[PDB]
Design a protein around this ligand. Structure first.
Ligand SMILES: *[C@@H]1O[C@H](CO)[C@@H](O)[C@H](O)[C@H]1NC(C)=O
Ligand SMILES: *[C@@H]1O[C@H](CO)[C@@H](O)[C@H](O)[C@H]1NC(C)=O
Ligand SMILES: *[C@@H]1O[C@H](CO)[C@@H](O)[C@H](O)[C@H]1NC(C)=O
Lengths: 495, 109, 75, 75, 99, 49, 50, 75
């Protein structure tokens, strides 16, 4: 029931020979795994933690100047010198001013002038980095037991969370009553934390590209620097003003916090106050359902009366969830649940909370099932007092096919070349598709890095037009496909 | 904004007695954050029902909850002497706060 | 400044909403529209120059769009 | 951001030096150079697109320049 | 002389008294008393709702977030009528004086 | 959630590129611009003649 | 839709397209009307007063 | 006005009479007829324009009918 009520649900159906399935886990998403003899499980990536961050650069977003000094030299005497030019905590500039008898000079020319001021940082943004071995993905595996944890906390069940680290990427959950599940994850491929910086700025943290971070035009410290006083690009945070040729001056350029916020658009925000927590990204895992068994398959039908205690509702995914209570004898019984037609001649829908059972009489169990599009009837119980529930599913099968194609394409857009692993059961077609996607995505990312979505749409339109106005059919079709894919990615790029 | 409940209620032992918790479209008419608390004298409130009808693990099955429109109801079927207590209704409102009923005193006699 | 290099085409993007993604999506186009409205004179010259340079109508439109998009931003 | 709408072409310039004339004279060209260095792939594809669209070297070179100048800008 | 203020821009603000209101799917928009006040910046959006968070339906529930906007620094812009425009000129003859 | 989106002093300083600075601290003084004048030499007589 | 002791069964989208000032379904104050301008007119006949 | 967007053509009709079906069935026809009577000048211009945009009596009659129906409606 944890995975219900989340609009980004994914249904992964089927395990291969070996009883394993490849599932990508995303933070905002959730995965419901359906296997034939296995119970239905819900997998959610609820946390990614980076530990032991190391700073590589401390940028200055707000500074001040305190000790301004000037040296002036008469024309043809060369540029002047201040003793504080050697000082790395001072920012200096060389200019020229008009000189002559009026200035106490005696030569009437452009006399070089140098002005220096002490650069002091008042606000900085850290750029901590983390080693890929220090990530820790937390995952919650919850099965469709149809039951609840129960408020009585003296016993706490149904809450198995597994931590996955690059060192320990294989772990098993012990779901009570359902055996155990094995997750064979690959954290080292989910995110390249050697090309990412945990940018923290005034109680707000972002995850950013490392080259982008190193390219920022603000003054920076090495990161091990413990006293400031050696800022590198101090000239980017100051301005030297020589109106006409009378005097030279230097002033600071105000807090760069808002300009940084503008620069950070397109960077995913993370948390860095109580640990470095990243609620973004994906995990590729292999699900080992071999030692996963349905609970209570030795039980018998209830042969009793059920009452609906939570009225049937339709989730955002085309399934229906209902909560029924059993009022009969033989408490540990399988619940007779069918999605038939009006005459009950055909089975039209397949339930999702597979093998719904009653463990205690006074313990409601909520069933999730997938009805067909249109009229359908939910039948619960057996002939005496059997409760028959009607339902109408408003969609269309063609509409569902379109929605699933759209969802698959969107997954490809986000997890490019990793979308081939979301539900893959091995196979040769999946491998060929993934290899082709890797080869094509290498070129696409090379040719489209650092381009805004508007530029992507423009380039897609241009390429589509070029392909349309192409004599060669072999070139025209390829160009049109490239243009349409570019247009799609540009229309669904910013996230 | 306090949820409205009858000041008092009495029912003969072994009978069934119902309590009402009338609220607005935000507190008890808009959301299923309806909970019933039983408080014996000199003791902290005890969660009797939640999600309208669901009852805690230790809570007897004699306690049943219903909700209709802006009104949520609590029913007791056994009416044992131990059931005589003060019952409070609460709801999590649309603005993110918690509102409590005025509380009904149930007496068996 | 830093605001002129706004961490857009860096990959690293996911399902989770990015920072300032509601506004930055269209604020550039809004800015270009405001510039074109506030400076009609240049847009006419850009159209005339694109017409002169562009042999076909595809080249002319492409050149005009590029010119009018780069005129304010190049500032 | 306000930083994307500077006060450059307002036509009020006098002989007196402006706010960041020395600094901001070449900042945009520096940004274009850095972006082109960090993202060569878009440069090659922009050159290919300009060569295809442009029937004459003038059109091709102009299109390539405009594409390269506008790509970092929206970025 | 005597410039007149034409507009005050805010360059540094702060948000306080943040509040949110939610409604179940298909039941319309949530309401916040602070929406009436213009010192509060507010936005409407949709969140996932369902049994888990107290709704009987499983759609996109509307939500409104309101916070109080307070300005901390200003960028006042003033105007001057050309009449109050004292210019100062210095005329020095080539008298040849020593200084 | 709602966040206040930083301080725009530096962003404005960058936006003011191409604008000449003036002194409004006390008096709203301007040290930029021109002034066209017509000079009358009628009453000018050489000193020391 | 019910209006002054008469009720109608209307289309939902049509009802939400109505050009009148409205309040949300759950609004306690009753005073934050949304599109008030549909029920008031502003007069500036001669550009003298409004 | 709300009166300018009636609850007509919404697909919710049943056997039971709607709110003002009998009265409002021919209101539009009555209004167009009254407008045509009061404003015979525009009808002649509409006929002339329909004939000018002709090549077929079906086209001319359809265009004239549409213009006459839209003249009061546009108000
Ligand atoms: C800078 O000026 C301060 C006065 O505010 C003075 O105390 C300090 O010694 C100076 N430091 C230098 C000149 O390095
Ligand atoms: C300028 O004039 C002042 C006063 O007339 C005199 O003291 C000074 O020596 C002159 N020369 C300068 C300031 O170079
Ligand atoms: C906002 O909260 C402060 C407490 O931090 C309080 O003093 C003030 O009255 C509140 N304002 C409003 C409009 O609720």
């Amino acid at each position: 029931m944890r995975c219900i009520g989340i609009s980004n649900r994914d249904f992964v159906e089927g395990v291969s020979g070996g009883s394993w399935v490849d599932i990508v886990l995303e933070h905002g998403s959730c995965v419901t795994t359906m296997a034939k003899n296995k119970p239905t499980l819900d997998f959610e990536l609820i946390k990614t933690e980076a530990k032991h961050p190391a700073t590589l650069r401390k940028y200055c977003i707000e500074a001040k100047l305190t000790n301004t000094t000037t040296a002036s030299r008469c024309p043809t005497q060369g540029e002047p010198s201040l003793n504080e030019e050697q000082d790395k905590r001072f920012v200096c500039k060389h200019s020229m001013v008009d000189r002559g008898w009026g200035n106490g000079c005696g030569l009437f020319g452009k006399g070089g002038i140098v002005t220096c001021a002490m650069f002091t940082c008042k606000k900085n943004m850290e750029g901590k980095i983390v080693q890929p071995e220090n990530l820790e993905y937390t995952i919650v595996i919850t099965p469709h037991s149809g039951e609840e944890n129960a408020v009585g906390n003296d016993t706490g069940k149904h809450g198995k969370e597994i931590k996955v680290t690059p060192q320990s990427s294989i772990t098993e959950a012990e779901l009570t009553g359902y055996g155990t599940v094995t997750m064979e994850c690959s954290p080292r491929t989910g995110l390249d934390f050697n090309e990412m910086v945990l940018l923290q700025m005034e109680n707000k943290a972002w995850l950013v590209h490392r080259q982008w971070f190193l390219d920022l035009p603000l003054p920076w410290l090495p990161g091990a620097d413990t006293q400031g006083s050696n800022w590198i690009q101090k000239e980017t945070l100051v301005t030297f003003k020589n109106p006409h040729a009378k005097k030279q001056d230097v002033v600071v350029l105000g807090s760069q916090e808002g300009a940084m916020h503008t620069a950070l658009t397109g960077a995913t925000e993370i948390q860095m106050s109580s640990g470095n927590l990243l609620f973004t990204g994906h995990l590729k895992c292999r699900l080992r359902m071999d030692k996963l068994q349905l609970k209570g398959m030795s039980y018998s039908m209830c042969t009793g009366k059920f009452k609906v205690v939570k009225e049937i509702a339709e989730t955002q995914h085309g399934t229906i969830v209902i909560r029924v209570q059993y009022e009969g004898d033989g408490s540990p019984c399988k619940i007779p649940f069918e999605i038939m037609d009006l005459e009950k001649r055909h089975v039209l829908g397949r339930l999702i909370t597979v093998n719904p059972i009653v463990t205690e009489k006074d313990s409601p169990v909520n069933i999730e099932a997938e009805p067909p599009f249109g009229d359908s009837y939910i039948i619960i119980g057996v002939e005496p007092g059997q409760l028959k529930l009607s339902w109408f599913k408003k969609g269309s099968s063609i509409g569902q096919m379109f929605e699933t194609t759209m969802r698959g394409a969107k997954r490809m857009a986000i997890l490019g070349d990793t979308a081939w692993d979301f539900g893959s059961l091995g196979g040769v077609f999946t491998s060929i598709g993934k290899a082709l996607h890797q080869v094509f995505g290498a070129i696409y990312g090379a040719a489209f890095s650092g381009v805004s979505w508007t530029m992507k749409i423009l380039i897609g339109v241009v390429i589509t037009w070029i392909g349309m106005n192409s004599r060669s059919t072999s070139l025209s079709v390829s160009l049109v496909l490239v243009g349409v894919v570019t247009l799609y990615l540009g229309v669904m790029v910013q996230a | 904004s306090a949820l409205t409940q009858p000041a008092s209620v009495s029912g003969s032992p072994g009978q069934s007695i119902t309590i009402s918790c009338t609220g607005t479209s935000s507190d008890v008419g808009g959301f299923n954050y309806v909970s019933w608390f039983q408080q014996h004298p000199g003791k902290a409130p005890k969660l009797m029902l939640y999600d309208v009808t669901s009852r805690p693990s230790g809570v007897s099955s004699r306690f049943s909850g219903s909700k209709s429109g802006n009104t949520a109801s609590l029913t007791i079927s056994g009416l044992q002497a131990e059931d005589e207590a003060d019952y409070y209704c609460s709801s999590h409102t649309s603005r993110g706060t918690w509102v409590f009923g005025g509380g009904t005193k149930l007496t068996v006699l | 400044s830093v605001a002129l290099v706004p961490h857009v085409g860096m990959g690293l993007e996911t399902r989770t909403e990015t920072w300032m993604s509601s506004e930055g999506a269209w604020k550039h186009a809004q800015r270009i529209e405001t510039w074109v409205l506030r400076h009609p004179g240049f847009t006419i010259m850009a159209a005339i120059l694109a017409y002169t340079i562009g042999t076909t109508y595809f080249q002319r439109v492409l050149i005009f769009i590029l010119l009018t998009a780069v005129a304010p931003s190049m500032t």
